[PDB]
Design a protein around this ligand. Structure first.
Ligand SMILES: Nc1ncnc2c1ncn2[C@@H]1O[C@H](COP(=O)(O)OP(=O)(O)OC[C@H]2O[C@@H](O)[C@H](O)[C@@H]2O)[C@@H](O)[C@H]1O
Ligand SMILES: [Zn+2]
Lengths: 279, 26
């Protein structure tokens, strides 16, 4: 029995009031929140999958780049590509900063992020779950030996398949896969434990910059109690879900507007242009 | 910020269209 929309929650004014009153908010983010930072998303015309279709045409499809059964067959394309998506030196967006402030004020239950760019950490968001893992560690496909990212980093930027140092040198599949979640893999245990704790505590869900096309993250809106209000902030509507309020557009533009309506420290996040103040 | 960044187009009861919405694309 899927989640219907609440008839009594509709407007941007309603959204502001909820942000004012709610104190256990889940923010579910996807690649859209980093687009303004200079990191393209996955599924848009200028995104990762479109690029992969051009730069790696031999793949059965762009998704195969992040598919565990394909990686097992041939990990060479991924290690040719991985440095392109390795965390760089980008600055967090306004949306990241907004989420960080909510957490600072004690109002953020969790930021479930699908991104591997680590910008939530840079922004000082603490209550993060990296749903789709990260490059922070790597794990041998065969024996599950773990290493820190610095152990495979050199190989990654040299576009070479890093080798397990424990397994036999003649074991073909003894390769160190960074612990980014691929299609066909489990999400980190942290995700499942956090969701079990959070689902009956959340009092507001805000989805920002995601197409919610991948499970189980895409199941979050239907897994929480139906009465919990849901707000979408995204360039595109999500026709497969029933949000209460749909704010469609650039997420920094929309969050900027919400921040000014909230006032207090939220308006202060938007330091450009400069507001009226005494020197 | 962008042209008319603080304005939206409203489709009642609950949809707001801001700068950058994909609906503006061709
Ligand atoms: N500046 C922006 N403001 C608001 N929304 C935006 C912006 N830029 C992009 N978007 C929207 O964000 C969404 C991004 O969707 P995806 O590219 O599909 O990215 P994401 O939802 O995070 O993907 C989930 C998962 O797919 C997997 O392959 C990969 O593992 C990834 O984590 C789209 O709906 C897109 O319109
Ligand atoms: Zn091994």
């Amino acid at each position: 029995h899927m989640r219907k929309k609440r008839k009594d929650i509709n407007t941007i004014e309603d959204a502001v009031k909820l942000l004012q009153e709610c104190k256990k908010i889940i923010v579910l983010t996807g690649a859209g929140v980093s687009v303004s930072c200079g990191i393209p998303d996955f599924r848009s015309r200028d995104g990762i999958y479109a690029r992969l279709a051009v730069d790696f045409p031999d793949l059965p499809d762009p998704q195969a780049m992040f598919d565990i059964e394909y990686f097992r067959k041939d990990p060479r394309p991924f290690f040719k590509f991985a440095k392109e998506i390795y965390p760089g030196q980008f600055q967090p967006s306004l949306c990241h900063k907004f989420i960080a402030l909510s957490d600072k004020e004690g109002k953020l239950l969790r930021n479930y992020t699908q991104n591997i760019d680590t910008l939530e950490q840079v922004a000082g968001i603490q209550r993060i779950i990296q749903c789709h893992g990260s490059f922070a560690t790597a794990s041998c496909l065969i024996c599950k030996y773990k290493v820190d990212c610095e152990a495979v980093r050199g190989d990654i930027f040299n576009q070479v398949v890093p080798r397990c140092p424990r397994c036999p040198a003649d074991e073909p599949l003894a390769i160190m896969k960074p612990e980014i979640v691929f299609f066909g893999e489990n999400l980190p245990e942290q995700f499942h434990r956090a969701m079990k704790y959070d689902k009956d505590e959340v009092d507001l869900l805000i989805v920002i910059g995601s197409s919610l096309k991948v499970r189980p993250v895409a199941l979050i809106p239907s897994s929480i109690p139906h009465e919990v209000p849901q707000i979408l902030i995204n360039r595109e509507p999500l026709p497969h879900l029933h949000f209460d309020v749909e704010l469609l557009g650039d997420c920094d533009v929309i969050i900027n507007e919400l921040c000014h309506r909230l006032g207090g420290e939220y308006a202060k996040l938007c330091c450009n242009p400069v507001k009226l103040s005494e020197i | 910020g962008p042209h008319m960044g603080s304005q939206y187009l409203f489709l009642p009861p609950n949809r707001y269209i801001f700068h950058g919405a994909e609906v503006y694309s061709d």
